[PDB]
Write a protein that holds these residues in place. Structure first.
Motif, short mmCIF file in Angstrom:
data_model
loop_
_atom_site.label_atom_id
_atom_site.label_comp_id
_atom_site.label_asym_id
_atom_site.label_seq_id
_atom_site.Cartn_x
_atom_site.Cartn_y
_atom_site.Cartn_z
N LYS A 170 0.88 -1.40 0.03
CA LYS A 170 0.09 0.08 -0.02
C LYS A 170 0.74 1.40 -0.18
CE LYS A 170 -4.13 1.91 2.07
NZ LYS A 170 -5.18 2.32 3.11
N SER A 172 3.01 1.91 2.57
CA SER A 172 4.31 1.74 3.48
C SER A 172 5.58 1.04 3.02
CB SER A 172 3.98 1.39 4.94
OG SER A 172 2.47 1.87 5.28
N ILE A 174 9.05 -0.70 4.79
CA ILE A 174 10.30 -0.78 5.85
C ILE A 174 11.44 -1.51 5.54
CG2 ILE A 174 8.04 -1.40 7.42
CD1 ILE A 174 9.00 -4.20 7.62
N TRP A 194 5.43 11.05 5.43
CA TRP A 194 6.18 10.51 6.83
C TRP A 194 7.15 9.51 6.79
CZ3 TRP A 194 5.78 5.20 7.36
CH2 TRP A 194 4.62 4.57 6.58
N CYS A 195 7.67 9.20 7.92
CA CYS A 195 8.65 8.42 8.00
C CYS A 195 9.01 8.04 9.48
CB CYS A 195 10.16 8.89 7.45
SG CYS A 195 10.69 10.41 8.35
N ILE A 198 11.51 2.63 14.28
CA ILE A 198 10.79 1.86 15.28
C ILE A 198 12.03 0.85 15.95
CG2 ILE A 198 8.70 0.43 15.58
CD1 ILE A 198 8.18 3.11 14.01
N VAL A 227 9.46 6.37 20.55
CA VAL A 227 9.46 5.52 19.09
C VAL A 227 9.14 6.93 18.34
CG1 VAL A 227 8.20 4.13 17.83
CG2 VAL A 227 8.46 3.72 20.54
N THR A 229 7.71 8.00 15.21
CA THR A 229 6.63 7.65 14.37
C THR A 229 5.97 8.97 13.70
OG1 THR A 229 4.72 7.56 15.96
CG2 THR A 229 5.84 5.51 15.36
N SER A 230 5.28 9.34 12.51
CA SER A 230 4.82 10.70 12.02
C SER A 230 5.97 11.56 11.81
CB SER A 230 3.73 10.91 13.11
OG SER A 230 2.57 10.21 12.78
N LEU A 248 14.31 -0.35 12.98
CA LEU A 248 13.44 -0.54 11.84
C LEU A 248 13.14 0.81 11.11
CD1 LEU A 248 12.13 -2.86 10.14
CD2 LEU A 248 9.99 -2.23 11.36
N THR A 250 10.97 3.00 8.58
CA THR A 250 9.73 2.90 7.61
C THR A 250 9.34 4.36 7.32
OG1 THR A 250 7.56 2.39 8.10
CG2 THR A 250 8.27 3.87 9.80
#
Ligand code: PYI
Ligand code: PYI
Ligand code: AMP
Ligand code: MG
Ligand code: MG
Lengths: 255, 243
Positions: A170, A172, A174, A194-195, A198, A227, A229-230, A248, A250
């Motif tokens: 979709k 994303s 990783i 975004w990126c 993790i 963490v 995110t966003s 990780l 992403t």
């Protein structure tokens, strides 16, 4: 040292990678394609075209078979591995009659994804060819335990093949960053907004980055602690990451 | 000494279970309606309101959140209006160091103490699909939740449920009849060096669970209807929800 004249001094190797490059129309990467048991995203056709080798993990074949009617002979995998607790009888049949190599991988201690990489790695050395990256489609949606399994495969991958492995589904992507320094080029134009970083397996006690809106400076990344995110890019078109443990990465894919 | 818990209980048509419902920014699964009906309190995290709104068109007055928290950069203006007009409490949470889900739990906990309410569990819908960095954030929220509220929190979307097992012993009742075929123990965060289980096809006996070493996925039940888990560190429990 003992030579004379100018001599480069200082220098540490860095891993220079460009994530979403395989998604670029032109270009000449040299990569393998792995299809997992998940809905195939439209970008799959272009990726298939330029792939050096393509394969499917069990159910992955069903999804490929069902989305390529009228032109399936144009989408014949080099091999379909797995345990066949997913590929339909007729689909297993079709690919077998067209010459596709159907490899059984019974092991109930490992997912078909992992086992598929083992077969791919073997076919890679065995065909004296080398890849710059292994592009995996699917594995980030659906069953939660399977999403985690995919992440865990990226860990074992380090002992299965030396070729970098990315997972896309979709919007994303990783990619597991091993300990050390990394230089990620996020200037292909295919990048999303975004990126993130993790800590999956364990806390990363010393992370330093550049190119992000929220950079880390010898900071600790760990669930329950911090963490990322966003997060987003600073616009430089480059992201560098230095981590003490597997971290990780992403990122979003445009559109 | 232990916590006896039954995960998929809120999904049972029968029961007196007192729980709160939190809608995240993801498409609502059909189970939504029933869960909403018996919830003691309902809320939405930013975008969650959009999905609720677009789902309940024509009968939105039967589905009015008790409060919508967020940062309104996902809630469409028309949606933000509607709910404000009907009496819904719109709470702004600008904090860009925390997701609208974590902040929503903060508002929720406050409302719970504030209303001298007693809750057995907080059911969160969504958060396990879509953006990958999102799924992880959801997991991370469960870690922070331990300092936000004492009420157990579960997250469900499509066919999956996740629940964070804190250090100690746990007794999970998986005999509601709503259980799916798979389940698993995920050592996100850090390696769990001493895991002991009961009721699984592949049990662990003081074993190590850690990414790259051993992660329990595609596990299943032994049919006893009970699963017990002793862990030294936070261990993420995930299970399938029937068709
Ligand atoms: C300890 C332990 N846990 C769990 C288990 C199980 N597992 C794991 C891994 C892998 C496998 C196989 C499966 O894969 P697939 O092909 O994908 O199938 P599904 O179900 O997912 O669809 C398993 C079984 C063990 N072994 N151990
Ligand atoms: C280190 C670091 N990294 C990153 C960041 C960023 N962040 C985080 C967390 C949270 C947030 C917010 C978001 O949430 P949401 O609102 O829900 O999403 P969207 O889609 O809506 O936007 C952030 C930003 C930091 N801070 N740090
Ligand atoms: N729901 C899912 N979500 C993510 N990856 C999946 C899912 N189901 C299957 N896979 C992946 O697809 C591979 C083979 O699919 P299957 O044998 O049909 O389960 C597995 O080894 C997984 O890595
Ligand atoms: Mg299989
Ligand atoms: Mg927001």
């Amino acid at each position: 040292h003992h030579s004379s004249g100018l001599v480069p001094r200082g220098s540490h190797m860095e891993h220079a990678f460009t994530p979403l490059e395989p998604l670029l129309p032109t270009g000449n990467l040299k990569y393998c394609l792995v299809v997992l048991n998940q809905p195939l995203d439209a970008r799959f056709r272009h990726l298939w075209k330029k792939a050096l080798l393509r394969a499917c993990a069990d159910g992955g074949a069903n999804h490929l078979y069902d989305l390529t009617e009228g032109e399936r002979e144009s989408f014949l995998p080099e091999f379909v591995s797995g345990d066949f607790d997913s590929i339909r009888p007729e689909v297993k049949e079709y690919y077998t009659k067209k010459g596709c190599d159907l490899i059984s991988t019974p092991d109930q201690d490992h997912t078909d994804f992992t086992k598929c990489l083992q077969v791919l790695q073997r076919k890679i050395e065995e065909k004296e060819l080398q890849v710059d990256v292994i592009v995996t489609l699917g594995g980030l949606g659906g069953r939660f335990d399977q999403i985690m399994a995919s992440v865990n495969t990226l860990f074992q991958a380090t002992h299965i093949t030396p070729v970098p492995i990315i997972i896309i589904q979709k919007d994303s992507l990783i990619y597991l960053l091993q300990p050390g320094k990394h230089r990620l080029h996020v200037d292909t134009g295919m990048e999303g907004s975004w990126c993130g970083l993790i800590p999956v397996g364990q806390p990363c006690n010393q992370v330093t980055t550049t190119g992000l809106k929220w950079n880390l400076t010898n900071d600790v990344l760990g669930f329950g602690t911090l963490v990322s995110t966003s997060n987003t890019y600073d616009g430089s078109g480059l992201v560098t990451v230095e981590t003490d443990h597997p971290l990780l990465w992403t990122m979003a894919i445009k559109s």
